[PDB]
Amino acid sequence: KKISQYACQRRTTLNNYNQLFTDALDILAENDELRENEGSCLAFMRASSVLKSLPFPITSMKDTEGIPCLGDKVKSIIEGIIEDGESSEAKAVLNDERYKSFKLFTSVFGVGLKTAEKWFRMGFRTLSKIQSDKSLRFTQMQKAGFLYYEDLVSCVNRPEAEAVSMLVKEAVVTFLPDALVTMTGGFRRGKMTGHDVDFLITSPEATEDEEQQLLHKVTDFWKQQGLLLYCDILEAQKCFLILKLDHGRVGKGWKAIRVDLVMCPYDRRAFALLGWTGSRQFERDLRRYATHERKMMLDNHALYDRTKRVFLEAESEEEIFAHLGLDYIEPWERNA
DNA sequence: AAAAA
DNA sequence: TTTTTGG
DNA sequence: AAAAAC
Ligand SMILES: [Mg+2]
Ligand code: NA
Ligand SMILES: [Zn+2]
Ligand SMILES: [Zn+2]
């Protein structure tokens, strides 16, 4: 059948038969992100995403016929990999000094595009030279990023994610006993690793005040146990944390783990769950499909119909998919 | 960079 | 061709 | 301004 240009109309499981092509496309996309070429970045991310959905490996140029998001530039890259098993374009990016510096600097929690560019233009090339510099001033986020660097750069596995789930649930039910805690992100899509562990917290009986106070109560509780290594609460309501995960719950005997908690009103739980499950590409295409194909607006809180001038209600992800005129895609099929 | 407008 | 690309 | 998210 006809492969859609939208990730939300494709089933993308973790069994990628085209990793040789998508690893090269992911490097080219990352370079364009670093060079602030948003458009070329998006074109390589879409091409990589569509190849990830294929139930077979590309073995010839003829196999690319009728596949969307594969223009002339992308087909040249695929042709080159079929030729000798390597991408000369991706190899050049991997050896580029700006690309190497941007990957290294942005690997620090609290360092993005602007700070990485600033440090590179100052002549810095290593994290050791940045940390030991007497003139540089670091944000509270960067201080935590450097202090827990080794732990944060190693990836979180499923036993660790589960151990964190237990800590989150134990803390949450202490203040809201009827609260529902769901692991979202990559782990909900079936990944066996991740950079962090994400949770959606919601309560069917909590008041507007109770809902607002929960993340402050849970983080104060952890601060008292000496488990809160970093905390930033944002406006729903969410927090970006670093938690101390003791070895015994799954050297120094503990591991720093990046955790994100999202508190949402009970009614909006389907929109939040859908938004936080991801992948990033699946979310982008859901919103793009809603706008361009249905004249609808979708976000983590709601679904709005621009023609009917009404907000559409949903108690489940299935209901959101049905409002959009999409076949339901399971979370493990959203790895776009 | 690719597809829609 | 010019505009959009999550937002 | 910057970073943090899927
Ligand atoms: Mg995650
Ligand atoms: Na970063
Ligand atoms: Zn996260
Ligand atoms: Zn909204």
Q: Which of A72, A95, A118 is the last residue of a domain?
A: A95
Residue A39 annotated as part of some ligand binding site: no
AA letter at A185: G
- State whether A146 and A190 are in the same domain: no
How far is the centre of ligand 4, averaged over its atoms, from the C-alpha of A311 (Å)? 11
> Do A190 and A217 fall into the same domain?
yes
Domain that holds residue A323: 267-335
Instruction: State the CATH number of the domain containing residue A229.
Output: 3.30.460.10
- On whether both A121 and A135 belong to a single domain, the answer is yes
For residue A293, give the 3-state DSSP assignment: helix
> Measured CA to C1', what is the nucleotide nearest A45?
B1
CATH number at residue A18: 1.10.150.110
In the numeric block, which tokens belong to residue A306? 């621009």
Residue A2 and residue A38 in one domain: yes
Under 8 Å between Cβ of A148 and A256? yes
Q: Which residue is nearest to nucleotide C4 (CA to C1')?
A: A39
Give the CATH number of the domain where residue A108 resides: 1.10.150.20
Q: How far apart are CA A239 and CA A184, in angstroms?
A: 14
Do A91 and A43 reside in the same domain of the chain? yes
Q: Which residues, in sequence order, are CB contacts of A264 under 8 Å at separation 6+?
A: A200, A201, A202, A236, A237, A272, A301
Q: How far apart are CA A193 and CA A257, in angstroms?
A: 12
Q: What is the resolution of this structure in A?
A: 2.7
Same domain, residue pair A1 and A91: yes
Same domain, A33 and A70: yes
Counting the structural domains of chain A, the total is 4
Q: How far is the CA of A72 from the centre of ligand 3 (A)?
A: 35
Residue A47 (CA) to nucleotide B3 (C1'), in angstroms, measures 12
A260 touches strand D (CB under 7 A): yes
A318 and A259 part of one domain: no
Residues A168, A199 contacting (CB under 8 angstroms): yes
Of A266, A292, A311, the position where a domain reaches its end is: A266
Would the Cβ of A234 be found within 7 angstroms of any atom in strand D?
yes
Check which CATH number belongs to the domain holding A319 and give it: 3.30.210.10
| Nearest in space to A262 (alpha carbons), one of A250, A254, A246, A274 | A274
> What's the CA–C1' distance between A296 and C7, in Å?
14
Please tell me the distance from the alpha carbon of residue A282 to that of residue A8, in angstroms, as a whole number: 6
A261 C-alpha to ligand 3 centroid (Å): 8
- Examine the domain organization and report whether A177 and A257 are in the same domain: yes
Tell me how far CA of residue A238 lies from CA of A1, A136, A200, A207, in angstroms: 41, 30, 9, 17
A231 and A292 both lie in a single domain? no
- What residue ranges in chain A does DSSP mark as E strands? 156-157, 180-183, 193-194, 197-202, 228-234, 237-246, 254-263, 296-298, 303-305, 310-312
Last residue of a domain, one of A117, A138, A154: A154
Are residue A184 and residue A238 in the same domain, yes or no?
A: yes
